[PDB]
Write a structure and sequence with these properties.
It is classed as rna binding protein/rna. The entry lists the keywords Canonical RNA binding domain, RRM_6, PF14259, Structural Genomics, Joint Center for Structural Genomics, jcsg, Protein Structure Initiative, PSI-biology, RNA-binding protein, RNA Binding Protein-RNA complex, Partnership for T-Cell Biology, tcell. With 81 residues, the chain is α+β, with helices and mostly antiparallel strands. The protein has two helices and six strands; from the N terminus they run βαββαβββ.
């Protein structure tokens, strides 16, 4: 329903780094991607309680996690409903 896709996270980043990234917005669920070799890709799905929280979270676009800038993509209530 209401999630933000992340791209470009540092390899060493944890779910708590994702939580601090969107703070004070509190994700309800975090999903992290791993490659065929079991290594993190830097991509993650962050689920929010409401559409408004997922929309607010988008202001964090191009902000950083350590040295890496993060690319965000909104997956919440599209205009082609």
């Amino acid at each position: 329903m209401h999630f933000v896709h992340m791209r470009g996270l540092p390899f060493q980043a944890n779910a708590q780094d994702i939580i601090n990234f969107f703070a004070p917005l509190k994700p309800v669920r975090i999903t992290m991607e791993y490659s065929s070799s079991g290594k993190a890709t830097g991509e993650a799905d962050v689920h929010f309680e409401t559409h408004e929280d997922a929309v607010a979270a988008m202001l964090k676009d191009r902000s950083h996690v350590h040295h890496r800038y993060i690319e965000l993509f909104l997956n919440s209530c599209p205009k082609g409903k």
